[PDB]
Amino acid sequence: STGALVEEEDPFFKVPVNKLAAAVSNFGYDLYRVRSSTSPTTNVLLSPLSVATALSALSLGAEQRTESIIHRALYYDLISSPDIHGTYKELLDTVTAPQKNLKSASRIVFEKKLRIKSSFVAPLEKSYGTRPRVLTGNPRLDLQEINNWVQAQMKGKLARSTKEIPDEISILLLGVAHFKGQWVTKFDSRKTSLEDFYLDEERTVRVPMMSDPKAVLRYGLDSDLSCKIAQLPLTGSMSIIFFLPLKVTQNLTLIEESLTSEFIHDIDRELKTVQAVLTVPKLKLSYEGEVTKSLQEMKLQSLFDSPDFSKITGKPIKLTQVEHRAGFEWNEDGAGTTPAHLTFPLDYHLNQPFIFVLRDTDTGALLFIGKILDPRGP
Ligand SMILES: [Zn+2]
């Protein structure tokens, strides 16, 4: 009984920037689901906000039908906003503020010699703080310039791309993000040690495992999903929510099917503070790849056929590539250290495949999502 335009009753989602954050985050969970389906045996690491942002910005140059196609994928058609792009600037300003430890940037890149209308550039730069790049047609220079842009946006925290530049670009969208933050409570690195990680029912590896035997966290068991949910706070009003299956498995699909902005808000409200025997693997992960094909499965295929971008230029152009680069890291770093007496202990050992969601507490925005089949790497 959903899909109708109704007034928002949930207080957290009445806030326009939170309503927008929930919309583009729901695009991000959609993209995550497609990628995870495509990658049943490899880690999935995504920061889809940078991709949603490139698409939202590009929709400024779309005529009405194409614009609506982009807006439907971003869930804008369920918002009743007079200023979607003004709200977006606020969203971006909030989640990339310095305390968030999150670098995120989106770029629109056009085929060589394209003449761009200043009536596109002006709202693009105002709301998204970005300017379109027109390629030169020299593959070496063009790849060097894009990597130099990623380097400056990410302050060198991502690896430069040794990937060849695509041969036939009309519109290329680039979404890049890096996150390395600090826990509210540091892990004692003296307690970090090599421990078993159950890749699956038959394969066990040894991985640097952080440990807090007396962790305070927020926790809840979701019986319907057979998974233990824990939330660990980060400095700068963010948290990581973990989804830990009860049985060793790489099949997280049932959990993945539930991931929406509204589900995650509900989970967050329902978690309760407990003490836990907590283990968390160290993570230093990176991803570089094209999400072109995944977006084509997300009702965006017509952007690649004959879309109408005549608000950008008179020359017929179309989406040809959407690139994502992401880097993500967590270690023991944190801001601080911490006749009967009864406790309620729980174990929370992330020593088997799990999903994590890095969420902004203020807006609820999805900042990063990982399916971690193997904490060592790809
Ligand atoms: Zn609520």
Author numbering: 35 to 372, 379 to 418
Could you share sentences copied from the article?
However, PEDF lacks a consensus sequence for the serpin reactive center region and exhibits no antiprotease activity, while being a major neurotrophic factor in the retina that promotes neurogenesis and enhances the viability of photoreceptors, amacrine cells, and other neurons. Interestingly, PEDF belongs to the serpins (SERPINF1), a family of serine proteinase inhibitors other members of which have also been identified as zinc-binding proteins, suggesting that zinc coordination is a common property of this family and may affect ocular proteostasis. PEDF acts through the interaction with cell surface receptors, mainly PEDF-R, which contribute significantly to the survival of retinal cells. Biophysical and X-ray crystallographic studies show that PEDF coordinates zinc ions in five types of intermolecular high-affinity sites, leading to a decrease in negative surface charge and reversible oligomerization of the protein, thereby masking the target recognition sites responsible for its neurotrophic and antiangiogenic activities and collagen binding.
To identify all the zinc coordination sites, we next crystallized PEDF in the presence of this metal and collected X-ray diffraction data. Crystals were obtained in two space groups, P21212 and P212121, with one and five protein molecules in the asymmetric unit. In both cases, the crystals gave diffraction data up to ~2 Å. Zinc binding sites were identified in both space groups: 1 site for P21212 and 7 sites for P212121. Importantly, all identified sites were located at the intermolecular interfaces and included coordinators from two or three protein molecules confirming the role of zinc as a promoter of PEDF oligomerization observed in DLS studies. The type 1 site, which was also predicted by ZincBind appears to be the strongest and most important, and its occupancy seems to affect the properties of PEDF at low zinc concentrations. Indeed, PEDF-R binding and neurotrophic activity of PEDF have been shown to be provided by its 44-mer fragment spanning amino acid residues at positions 78–12170,83–85. According to our structural analysis, zinc binding to sites of types 1, 4 and 5 results in this fragment localizing at the intermolecular interface of the resulting dimer/trimer, impeding its access to the receptor. Zinc concentration corresponding to filling the high-affinity site in PEDF (4 μM) matches the level of elevated zinc in AH of some patients with POAG (2–7 μM), suggesting that this metal is unlikely to bind to PEDF under normal conditions (0.4–0.5 μM Zn2+) but may be captured under pathologic conditions.
